[PDB]
Design an enzyme around this catalytic site. Sequence first.
Site, PDB file in Angstrom:
ATOM      1  N   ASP A   1       0.782  -3.138  12.682  1.00  0.00           N
ATOM      2  CA  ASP A   1       0.281  -4.507  12.766  1.00  0.00           C
ATOM      3  C   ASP A   1       1.273  -5.457  12.037  1.00  0.00           C
ATOM      4  O   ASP A   1       2.313  -5.008  11.528  1.00  0.00           O
ATOM      5  CB  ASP A   1      -1.134  -4.599  12.086  1.00  0.00           C
ATOM      6  CG  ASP A   1      -1.188  -4.358  10.569  1.00  0.00           C
ATOM      7  OD1 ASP A   1      -0.120  -4.113   9.957  1.00  0.00           O
ATOM      8  OD2 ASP A   1      -2.289  -4.368  10.012  1.00  0.00           O
TER       9      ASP A   1
ATOM     10  N   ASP B   1       0.803  -8.141   8.893  1.00  0.00           N
ATOM     11  CA  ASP B   1      -0.115  -8.634   7.857  1.00  0.00           C
ATOM     12  C   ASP B   1       0.339  -9.972   7.281  1.00  0.00           C
ATOM     13  O   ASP B   1       1.542 -10.212   7.151  1.00  0.00           O
ATOM     14  CB  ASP B   1      -0.261  -7.600   6.727  1.00  0.00           C
ATOM     15  CG  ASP B   1      -0.573  -6.221   7.228  1.00  0.00           C
ATOM     16  OD1 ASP B   1      -1.715  -5.996   7.648  1.00  0.00           O
ATOM     17  OD2 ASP B   1       0.358  -5.401   7.311  1.00  0.00           O
TER      18      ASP B   1
ATOM     19  N   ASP C   1      -3.335  -9.162  11.093  1.00  0.00           N
ATOM     20  CA  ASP C   1      -4.314  -9.187  10.010  1.00  0.00           C
ATOM     21  C   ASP C   1      -4.112 -10.428   9.106  1.00  0.00           C
ATOM     22  O   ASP C   1      -3.110 -10.527   8.394  1.00  0.00           O
ATOM     23  CB  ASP C   1      -4.264  -7.872   9.218  1.00  0.00           C
ATOM     24  CG  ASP C   1      -5.623  -7.376   8.749  1.00  0.00           C
ATOM     25  OD1 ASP C   1      -6.653  -7.845   9.296  1.00  0.00           O
ATOM     26  OD2 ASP C   1      -5.660  -6.504   7.855  1.00  0.00           O
TER      27      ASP C   1
HETATM   28  N1  LIG Z   1      -8.709  -3.482   4.434  1.00  0.00           N
HETATM   29  C1  LIG Z   1      -7.509  -3.417   3.858  1.00  0.00           C
HETATM   30  C2  LIG Z   1      -6.353  -3.095   4.635  1.00  0.00           C
HETATM   31  C3  LIG Z   1      -5.174  -3.016   3.994  1.00  0.00           C
HETATM   32  N2  LIG Z   1      -5.077  -3.248   2.633  1.00  0.00           N
HETATM   33  C4  LIG Z   1      -3.754  -3.220   1.958  1.00  0.00           C
HETATM   34  C5  LIG Z   1      -3.120  -1.838   1.903  1.00  0.00           C
HETATM   35  C6  LIG Z   1      -1.642  -2.059   2.216  1.00  0.00           C
HETATM   36  C7  LIG Z   1      -1.610  -3.408   2.935  1.00  0.00           C
HETATM   37  C8  LIG Z   1      -1.294  -3.425   4.410  1.00  0.00           C
HETATM   38  O1  LIG Z   1      -2.195  -2.572   5.162  1.00  0.00           O
HETATM   39  P1  LIG Z   1      -1.781  -1.846   6.502  1.00  0.00           P
HETATM   40  O2  LIG Z   1      -1.441  -2.939   7.590  1.00  0.00           O
HETATM   41  O3  LIG Z   1      -2.706  -0.839   7.044  1.00  0.00           O
HETATM   42  O4  LIG Z   1      -0.461  -1.053   6.140  1.00  0.00           O
HETATM   43  P2  LIG Z   1       1.113  -1.244   6.124  1.00  0.00           P
HETATM   44  O5  LIG Z   1       1.569  -0.755   4.751  1.00  0.00           O
HETATM   45  O6  LIG Z   1       1.465  -2.593   6.568  1.00  0.00           O
HETATM   46  O7  LIG Z   1       1.564  -0.153   7.195  1.00  0.00           O
HETATM   47  P3  LIG Z   1       1.562  -0.306   8.780  1.00  0.00           P
HETATM   48  O8  LIG Z   1       2.847  -0.285   9.356  1.00  0.00           O
HETATM   49  O9  LIG Z   1       0.670   0.844   9.263  1.00  0.00           O
HETATM   50  O10 LIG Z   1       0.872  -1.662   9.015  1.00  0.00           O
HETATM   51  O11 LIG Z   1      -2.879  -4.048   2.702  1.00  0.00           O
HETATM   52  C9  LIG Z   1      -6.229  -3.566   1.882  1.00  0.00           C
HETATM   53  O12 LIG Z   1      -6.133  -3.753   0.662  1.00  0.00           O
HETATM   54  N3  LIG Z   1      -7.428  -3.645   2.533  1.00  0.00           N
HETATM   55 MG   LIG Z   2       0.575  -3.403   8.111  1.00  0.00          MG
END
Ligand SMILES: Nc1ccn([C@H]2CC[C@@H](COP(=O)(O)OP(=O)(O)OP(=O)(O)O)O2)c(=O)n1
Ligand SMILES: [Mg+2]
Length: 357
Positions: free
Chosen positions: A196, A198, A281
């Site tokens: 995703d 973020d 996100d």
């Molecule tokens: N409900 C959530 C989801 C995520 N996080 C935090 C954990 C790490 C960060 C980003 O989450 P992800 O998008 O799942 O991970 P990423 O490290 O960006 O890895 P990916 O490539 O899978 O997105 O935010 C959080 O605190 N609460």
């Molecule tokens: Mg992520």
Amino acid sequence: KKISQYACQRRTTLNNYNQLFTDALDILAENDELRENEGSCLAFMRASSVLKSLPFPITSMKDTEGIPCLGDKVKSIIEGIIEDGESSEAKAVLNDERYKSFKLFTSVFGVGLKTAEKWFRMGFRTLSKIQSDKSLRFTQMQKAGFLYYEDLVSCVNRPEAEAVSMLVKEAVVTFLPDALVTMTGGFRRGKMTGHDVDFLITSPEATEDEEQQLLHKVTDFWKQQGLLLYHQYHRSHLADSAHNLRSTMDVFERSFCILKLDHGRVHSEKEGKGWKAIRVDLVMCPYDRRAFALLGWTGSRQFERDLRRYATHERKMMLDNHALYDRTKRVFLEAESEEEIFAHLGLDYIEPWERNA
Ligand SMILES: Nc1ccn([C@H]2CC[C@@H](COP(=O)(O)OP(=O)(O)OP(=O)(O)O)O2)c(=O)n1
Ligand SMILES: [Mg+2]
Ligand code: NA
């Protein structure tokens, strides 16, 4: 310099010298997750994380001397890779029908462990059989998952993440012109790809009602622009944040979206249908909590787990995505930066690109 058991006391870049070992530990961790053996899962994740921090490849069992988080089970895994160049344990997992099915079913956005197990016990093994089954019923999230399957399994690259950032900023500033938009997650840690994109949004002048309404305005705007393919709101739990004063419970309002990203907006070295579905996100936080929110949403997931474990076990402090509480002094510690949070914890500052634990 003795290697710490905590990822928050280690520098973990994307230069991994032990990918043969960590790839196998990751499969073994995922297998325990999909089978809900949380203890064994955590032991595999901690072992993988510490090997990712090593500045050299393991070539003998003598190299594992002094390394924390490496139990008897993990050590036999490492031994197996040294001898053959392959893990017999991880190979068996990859050949396991429950692992194969659970990995394939959960790769559909909207499908969790409960739905995956249900499909597996009905004798389903392929996504083709699920989608053509006359009797199955799908949640709205699962329908989006199936409709945009190929785009969503294909990960997001940095040029796509920057094209999304442009749409996020453009949407946000329409309703809050002073808002600060920061790309968080993996892309802030230097990752080339992500599942995703973020974002953390905060405003120095937004009112409680303005900040509580911004995410709803941003998605309505995208819905009006014909860019919203799916959305799910997550209400803030800041008034219930004391649940983290004992993983973390999410405290900030969040809007999860699936966006239609036209190819013309992406500035890369690179067709068919000129658009791609992207998971976005969006996190909105009150301005005084922005340093805690940035630290929490940057990750990695292991780095967060160890920051919290360290705060509790070593500093008698309680850390979550909005605050840092000192149990001894009976006070919340303020921070206008990630640097100030690390200093409050008595931790040497770790750069976002060193948080790939
Ligand atoms: N409900 C959530 C989801 C995520 N996080 C935090 C954990 C790490 C960060 C980003 O989450 P992800 O998008 O799942 O991970 P990423 O490290 O960006 O890895 P990916 O490539 O899978 O997105 O935010 C959080 O605190 N609460
Ligand atoms: Mg992520
Ligand atoms: Na899923």
